[PDB]
């Protein structure tokens, strides 16, 4: 037993690694869209850039999730980062709803780890997971909600003079 | 009586209490509007953002009726601030026109007020109204009418793209 | 449904629409309030400026809820603003009271709101409450009980030097 | 006939010849009022200080009238400038009371020429009386009732304390 550990539960800590293991992977599939978009074929250099900031951001949550576990005292055990589900994106609006979907995913494993982290009367995992992820998903999903309304409506991914300059207004 | 009071009839102070009323309604009516386009189903966020200045200006015309009536010595007697007609304002265009007629509408109240204080033989009171207001009223007309016009001939409210690079355009 | 909702109940939905009302109000109040010290037979400037000040805080907090609503994929649905209950606030320190008694009220709801968000497991909710609202009304709370207390020793309302020292040195 | 007259009626001319006469009036009653205050047995600097204010502002507005008078070409012709009412003002409270009677009368004449200016079709000056002498009246009146409503409360004229108060704290 780790000479810190406190009033961390060994359901939490599996749980930390869980949501470890998710982050890294929402991580990888926003590389693969961000080089997708790279391609001489697709060529929308600000949704590549929109989406590699994304996988960063993925990055560093995993980063400090994996600081939290060495904070109370657990034990990081690292899994397989699975390759992402698609290796073609087709289109800016499909790529946005997929991030979507991704998000809404990682928000109810965040809520789950929330939850148990209340059964177990783990207040100060469910204050940083509260501080530090929650609002984020939450501004994130609107985010990305926007964007999907916004690309639906000035007619993607039919015409594609919406997404290029959706890619140059917006997300430029 | 208040010692101040001099030159200010009874009827004139009735009518700044009533238009006091009305800017606070119009002002609820722009925050209304603008938080429509905050919406993750409508998603313009310059439009949203014009509304909310508009409604903190009527909060301003209103805060300068209130100064008015104490410096006049008359007395300020609020009433409930109606809600707006529409909870769902359907489109940039439509929210354009309806704010159109809404300054129309303020601006009937404030020729009214003025010849009001004509009648009164009330000077500073009609002083006040044409250096504070009816110039303000023009513009904001003038300005609205133009964008009603731009958004008609873009194409809106049945192309997306015409709101989507209005609000980019002209509202950004 | 939204896109973006998500874990968002119905009755949490609701009772944010209903706190946003209860916003609003208590902005109206201490608009009224403000202006009742800008009268010529009141004259306490500072007592005026106090209550403009907390009248556009509470025009802030209701925004910053319509924003939340609309980040869940809520649909906000204002209601009529009703008038303050007094016309006349009578001295500096009953309106102190009566902004102590708004003020918690107000709180009374945001606690009946965060029990709601509890009960209804919704995480990112209670930590919205908690982070934006909940010390914010314990620390007005406190402040006007301070200047009650203050404005009482000093021999307020008989007093009417008590109220004009107040205004100067606390309040200016 | 000046080469210059234009639409200007000789009633006008007279009005405001004797407008001239009442400010000059009035400069004197402020000079006497601001060194009543600098007596060794009254001792109130900046009751003095602001009377003396009071009495170069009213030199200034007569001045204006008489440039007003030559611009339109006019002549201007002088009378005696009678002495105050009164040698001793007796008190802060008194002195302001005095004051905002005096205002008052010098409001009621500016209104006077602006019924005349009507009726005789002259807008230009109609609009210099509503610019420069119509909305200084009434602060002025709102600013010396202000005053008073204060001094009152504090418990002035029997107070000394309560004028030696407002004279460090108001017109400080
Ligand atoms: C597997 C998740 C699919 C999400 N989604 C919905 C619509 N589109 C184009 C993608
Ligand atoms: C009740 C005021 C209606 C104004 N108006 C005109 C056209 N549109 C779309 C709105
Ligand atoms: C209706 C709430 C009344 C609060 N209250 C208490 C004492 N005073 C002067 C006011
Ligand atoms: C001749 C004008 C008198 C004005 N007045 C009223 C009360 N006090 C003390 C002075
Ligand atoms: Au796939
Ligand atoms: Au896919
Ligand atoms: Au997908
Ligand atoms: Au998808
Ligand atoms: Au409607
Ligand atoms: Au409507
Ligand atoms: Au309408
Ligand atoms: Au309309
Ligand atoms: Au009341
Ligand atoms: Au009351
Ligand atoms: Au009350
Ligand atoms: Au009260
Ligand atoms: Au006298
Ligand atoms: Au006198
Ligand atoms: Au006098
Ligand atoms: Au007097």
């Known amino acids: 037993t780790s000479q810190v550990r406190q009033n961390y539960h ?17 991580s990888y599939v926003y590389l693969s869209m961000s080089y997708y978009f790279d391609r001489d074929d697709v060529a929308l250099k600000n949704f590549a850039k929109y989406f590699l900031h994304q996988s960063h951001e993925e ?17 990081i055990f690292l899994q397989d980062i699975k390759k992402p589900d698609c290796d073609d994106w087709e289109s800016g609006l499909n790529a946005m709803e997929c991030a ?6 990682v928000n109810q494993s965040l809520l789950e780890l929330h939850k148990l982290a209340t059964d177990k009367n783990d207040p100060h995992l469910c204050d940083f ?44």
Chains 1, 2, 3, 4 share one sequence.
């Open 10 to 26: 060994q359901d939490s800590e599996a749980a930390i690694n869980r949501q470890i293991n998710l982050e890294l992977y929402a």
């Open 59 to 75: 990055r560093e949550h995993a980063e400090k999730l994996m600081k939290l576990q060495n904070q109370r005292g657990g034990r």
């Open 100 to 105: 979507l979907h991704l998000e809404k995913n």
């Open 129 to 172: 997971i509260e501080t530090h992820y929650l609002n984020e998903q939450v501004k994130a999903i609107k985010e990305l909600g926007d964007h999907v309304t916004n690309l639906r409506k000035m007619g993607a991914p039919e015409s594609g003079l919406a997404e290029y300059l959706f890619d140059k207004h917006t997300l430029g």
